Design a protein around this ligand. Sequence first.
Ligand SMILES: [Mg+2]
Ligand SMILES: [Mg+2]
Ligand SMILES: [Mg+2]
Ligand SMILES: [Mg+2]
Ligand SMILES: [Mg+2]
Ligand SMILES: [Mg+2]
Ligand SMILES: [Mg+2]
Ligand SMILES: [Mg+2]
Ligand SMILES: [Mg+2]
Ligand SMILES: [Mg+2]
Ligand SMILES: [Mg+2]
Ligand SMILES: [Mg+2]
Ligand SMILES: [Mg+2]
Ligand SMILES: [Mg+2]
Ligand SMILES: [Mg+2]
Ligand SMILES: [Mg+2]
Ligand SMILES: [Mg+2]
Ligand SMILES: [Mg+2]
Ligand SMILES: [Mg+2]
Ligand SMILES: [Mg+2]
Ligand SMILES: [Mg+2]
Ligand SMILES: [Mg+2]
Ligand SMILES: [Mg+2]
Ligand SMILES: [Mg+2]
Ligand SMILES: [Mg+2]
Ligand SMILES: [Mg+2]
Ligand SMILES: [Mg+2]
Ligand SMILES: [Mg+2]
Ligand SMILES: [Mg+2]
Ligand SMILES: [Mg+2]
Ligand SMILES: [Mg+2]
Ligand SMILES: [Mg+2]
Ligand SMILES: [Mg+2]
Ligand SMILES: [Mg+2]
Ligand SMILES: [Mg+2]
Ligand SMILES: [Mg+2]
Ligand SMILES: [Mg+2]
Ligand SMILES: [Mg+2]
Ligand SMILES: [Mg+2]
Ligand SMILES: [Mg+2]
Ligand SMILES: [Mg+2]
Ligand SMILES: [Mg+2]
Ligand SMILES: [Mg+2]
Ligand SMILES: [Mg+2]
Ligand SMILES: [Mg+2]
Ligand SMILES: [Mg+2]
Ligand SMILES: [Mg+2]
Ligand SMILES: [Mg+2]
Ligand SMILES: [Mg+2]
Ligand SMILES: [Mg+2]
Ligand SMILES: [Mg+2]
Ligand SMILES: [Mg+2]
Ligand SMILES: [Mg+2]
Ligand SMILES: [Mg+2]
Ligand SMILES: [Mg+2]
Ligand SMILES: [Mg+2]
Ligand SMILES: [Mg+2]
Ligand SMILES: [Mg+2]
Ligand SMILES: [Mg+2]
Ligand SMILES: [Mg+2]
Lengths: 117, 146, 64, 204
Amino acid sequence: PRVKGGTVTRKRRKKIVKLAKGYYGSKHLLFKVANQAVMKSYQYAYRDRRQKKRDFRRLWIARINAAARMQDLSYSKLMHGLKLAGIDINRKMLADLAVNDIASFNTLADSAKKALA
Amino acid sequence: MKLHELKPSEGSRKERNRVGRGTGSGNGKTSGRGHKGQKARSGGGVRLGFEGGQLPLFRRIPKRGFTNINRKEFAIVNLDVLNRFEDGTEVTPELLIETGIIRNEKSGIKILSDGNIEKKLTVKANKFSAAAKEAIEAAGGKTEVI
Amino acid sequence: PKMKTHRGSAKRFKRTGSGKLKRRHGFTSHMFANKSQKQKRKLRKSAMVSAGDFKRIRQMVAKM
Amino acid sequence: KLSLLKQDGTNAGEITLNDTVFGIEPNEKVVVDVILSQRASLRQGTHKVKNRSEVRGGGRKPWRQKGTGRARQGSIRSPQWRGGGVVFGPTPRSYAYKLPKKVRRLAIKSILSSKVNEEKLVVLEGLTFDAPKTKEFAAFLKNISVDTKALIVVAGESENVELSARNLQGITVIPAESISVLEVAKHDKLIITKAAVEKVEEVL
RNA sequence: GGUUCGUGGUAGGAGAGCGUUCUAAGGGCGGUGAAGUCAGACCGGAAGGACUGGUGGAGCGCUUAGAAGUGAGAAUGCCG
RNA sequence: GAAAGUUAUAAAUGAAGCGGUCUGGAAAGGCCCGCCAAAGACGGUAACAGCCCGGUAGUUGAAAUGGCUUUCCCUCCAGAGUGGAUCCUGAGUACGACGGAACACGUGAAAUUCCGUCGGAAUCCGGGAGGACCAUCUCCCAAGGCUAAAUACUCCCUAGUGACCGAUAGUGAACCAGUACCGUGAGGGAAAGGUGAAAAGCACCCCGGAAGGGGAGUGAAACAGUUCCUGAAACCGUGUGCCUACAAGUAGUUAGAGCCCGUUAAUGGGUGAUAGCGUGCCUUUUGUAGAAUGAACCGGCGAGUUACGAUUUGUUGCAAGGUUAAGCGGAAAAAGCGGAGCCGUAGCGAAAGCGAGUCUGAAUAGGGCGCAUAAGUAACAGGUCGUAGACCCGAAACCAGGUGAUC
Ligand SMILES: [Mg+2]
Ligand SMILES: [Mg+2]
Ligand SMILES: [Mg+2]
Ligand SMILES: [Mg+2]
Ligand SMILES: [Mg+2]
Ligand SMILES: [Mg+2]
Ligand SMILES: [Mg+2]
Ligand SMILES: [Mg+2]
Ligand SMILES: [Mg+2]
Ligand SMILES: [Mg+2]
Ligand SMILES: [Mg+2]
Ligand SMILES: [Mg+2]
Ligand SMILES: [Mg+2]
Ligand SMILES: [Mg+2]
Ligand SMILES: [Mg+2]
Ligand SMILES: [Mg+2]
Ligand SMILES: [Mg+2]
Ligand SMILES: [Mg+2]
Ligand SMILES: [Mg+2]
Ligand SMILES: [Mg+2]
Ligand SMILES: [Mg+2]
Ligand SMILES: [Mg+2]
Ligand SMILES: [Mg+2]
Ligand SMILES: [Mg+2]
Ligand SMILES: [Mg+2]
Ligand SMILES: [Mg+2]
Ligand SMILES: [Mg+2]
Ligand SMILES: [Mg+2]
Ligand SMILES: [Mg+2]
Ligand SMILES: [Mg+2]
Ligand SMILES: [Mg+2]
Ligand SMILES: [Mg+2]
Ligand SMILES: [Mg+2]
Ligand SMILES: [Mg+2]
Ligand SMILES: [Mg+2]
Ligand SMILES: [Mg+2]
Ligand SMILES: [Mg+2]
Ligand SMILES: [Mg+2]
Ligand SMILES: [Mg+2]
Ligand SMILES: [Mg+2]
Ligand SMILES: [Mg+2]
Ligand SMILES: [Mg+2]
Ligand SMILES: [Mg+2]
Ligand SMILES: [Mg+2]
Ligand SMILES: [Mg+2]
Ligand SMILES: [Mg+2]
Ligand SMILES: [Mg+2]
Ligand SMILES: [Mg+2]
Ligand SMILES: [Mg+2]
Ligand SMILES: [Mg+2]
Ligand SMILES: [Mg+2]
Ligand SMILES: [Mg+2]
Ligand SMILES: [Mg+2]
Ligand SMILES: [Mg+2]
Ligand SMILES: [Mg+2]
Ligand SMILES: [Mg+2]
Ligand SMILES: [Mg+2]
Ligand SMILES: [Mg+2]
Ligand SMILES: [Mg+2]
Ligand SMILES: [Mg+2]
């Protein structure tokens, strides 16, 4: 028997066109450029899902360095003292303390100073 | 079997492989053929024995022999088959042909000497081998050529 | 249509009891003054078709 | 082994069936194979399309090979053209095949024993009608509680049986040498008279 | 159900599946609205599958098998 | 030339529910009750009907013409034996040389048959053939003619069938199709289906020259109004929530304020100032963002298939055995019958032949191939191969029959 290709192609192409909503110009209207746009966006998402962790760690390091230079300490010396004192708090929590609990951050910095000497 | 629960024997039927239907199946663009040769073309290929110009094997060795028009080939019967005819029975070609042990007598019946027999039989046959000769006569039977 | 036997090789090959193919040596026509007696004495026997050639010429003598 | 009824709906004694026919252990894979074989050999296979050599027209090359700026073409009935010929498509062809004889005997043997296993088989001593009357046949089918699709097997008893039962939607009558694997499988119950049972035992 | 070792990949080998049209049996829904079509923020590891609402105005799924004119983004591809 | 019968070409008769009720524009549908059936095929009827209509099963019917089958009529008819003295039994033929062809058979060791050209028999005590030819034997009588059935095909007519198509499909043509159109001509050759159950196809009023509209009316529906069921995408517009005139951008992704909303309710939706990272898809390549190729965009169509053989794997039946083919039978069935044939059970040798062995050889030597150390076969399914166009499109060219000197 004959199998004419109805109802199956449009359903498959419309999903790809719908996935490209918000793209400039005809990238959200035409199947052929929408397909390439969707593929490229998936690849970009896959790569940036790795780059995001590095970006946030760099932000935390910069913030901790800024907060620790006010205690007459580098980021390098402070991290060495914290490792040498036995404290195991990651950069995320240290940046949080630096931003909105500066007294506790100063306490931790004092402990790190004690450990160094 | 209810005709709505037909389950054929497992492993007896497989799914045909369709080539050239997308790259997800591994048989997509070039369809299992490679890139741009004589073997990648429709109807393309060489003969069964072609070697690309080198002399084929069959043409560097000589022909041998002839065929005899009067060639005679006999229907072969060993000895162990004869063990399942009761002793005292006259073994004759028609008995063999209707017993089913001989499908067709090509040019006659010849008795060979594989196995052992131990019962007295008298055998009617077109040809005998010497070993089969003393094998039959050592059990007290006799052999005569038709 | 049923497939045809290569008649040029049905005159050269013989099928043995294990399914292999038996052939003849091929330097035995007309220059016997140029090959020694050991060579001639060994070339007059029969040989076997090798595996590489059998892979190639199976179909041609299928019903031979 | 079985209870023998009558056309009136009552009992008339007992009937024994040959154990080598109605009492073997069914072989389901063989039955499936034979059902597929019998259903595949019922189809006509009268279907065809036209190649690029059978569509009317063609021959002339539509335009030059070079210089015109269009794609190279060779006919107006090529496969990719709008009215062109089909590439492979269907051809008239037969589908029938048969399994070895012993397998085909074992299949009917098994599918006929399975009916006895499921208590779907009814044996009655005789089935006859003075004249064709579908009302009386419906009454008889009401007397013997069936209320479903059934296959009635008969012998040389009454020709009025076949005529007075071809209007009922799920009823089929066969004369005891036409018994089939695919006919038996197609129906639910199986009413067979004594003479038909004797014939079936004789044949196989 | 557990322990150990693994899981980049072109040509290519092997395996398991989704979806389309038709047939057979069982079992269903549909003028209290079928297929199609439009829109959604739902579900599955993928191909994909439901649910709800609008338009439409008469046919269509499900389960187990079987058969194929079986899945298109490209051919200076053919037609609109 | 008649009589009878049958059949083909018009037709007749033909059972049973206006059943109640619900939705609905309309009931054939749902629910609850009845009946017919040798009739539950098919189609129509305001949605899906055995019981509404045409019909169906069954039973009937032919004035007229044709076909067929018998019978009568009509016509026409010698066949056995024994002797076979003597006569007859296909002449420029049968053959042969030379040159060709047909035979599976390419001149070959070339029998058999036919054509052209030359030569040219015997005739029953005779002649031909049995793959050069001779002898023996076996079979048969050329150089005259006729002959049904079994076989091949379908422009047609009747009755049906389909795991055949469904308007880019199926015939080139579902429609005034070999038409319109193109060409001097031979010749090439399209596009184009659907209002509604029923035209009930919009009386009348208003703007306008008209077309076209807004009401009114018919209709279940007019967003069914004469390309009229459904009505996707490209493409063209109107209105608006968020952003945008100091900015260098494969147009996105990750972080993210502000503003606007409220869902298949869940760590939701829309837009996004600013910051980081980021040179399309395909093909072909050692290597392409490539200044190498293809694609304006959207839609439909468009490429490993089938038949018959070979081989290998999986499954099923039987097993030293396995299995039928054509055909008969039948419903385009299923059994049954059909053992002819095929593969296997023994191999070695060029062959005579020998045989669990055999060949080479002077050999009981050695060595090659085999047995010991035995599972095959039928059917189906997957992979690959062969003959077929064989995976799809693409040449320049070749041959055969015709049409052209209106340039
Ligand atoms: Mg269809
Ligand atoms: Mg398509
Ligand atoms: Mg945006
Ligand atoms: Mg890190
Ligand atoms: Mg597969
Ligand atoms: Mg691959
Ligand atoms: Mg591709
Ligand atoms: Mg390529
Ligand atoms: Mg290359
Ligand atoms: Mg290659
Ligand atoms: Mg080709
Ligand atoms: Mg030689
Ligand atoms: Mg041999
Ligand atoms: Mg020599
Ligand atoms: Mg042509
Ligand atoms: Mg041509
Ligand atoms: Mg161009
Ligand atoms: Mg066509
Ligand atoms: Mg991998
Ligand atoms: Mg593969
Ligand atoms: Mg459909
Ligand atoms: Mg809908
Ligand atoms: Mg296709
Ligand atoms: Mg396109
Ligand atoms: Mg165009
Ligand atoms: Mg009536
Ligand atoms: Mg009603
Ligand atoms: Mg309707
Ligand atoms: Mg000659
Ligand atoms: Mg002549
Ligand atoms: Mg002679
Ligand atoms: Mg002969
Ligand atoms: Mg001879
Ligand atoms: Mg004649
Ligand atoms: Mg249409
Ligand atoms: Mg058409
Ligand atoms: Mg004209
Ligand atoms: Mg209409
Ligand atoms: Mg008007
Ligand atoms: Mg509408
Ligand atoms: Mg309608
Ligand atoms: Mg639109
Ligand atoms: Mg500036
Ligand atoms: Mg600005
Ligand atoms: Mg959001
Ligand atoms: Mg490469
Ligand atoms: Mg280069
Ligand atoms: Mg550029
Ligand atoms: Mg190129
Ligand atoms: Mg271009
Ligand atoms: Mg191929
Ligand atoms: Mg087996
Ligand atoms: Mg049969
Ligand atoms: Mg030896
Ligand atoms: Mg196969
Ligand atoms: Mg071509
Ligand atoms: Mg010519
Ligand atoms: Mg001519
Ligand atoms: Mg002229
Ligand atoms: Mg002139």
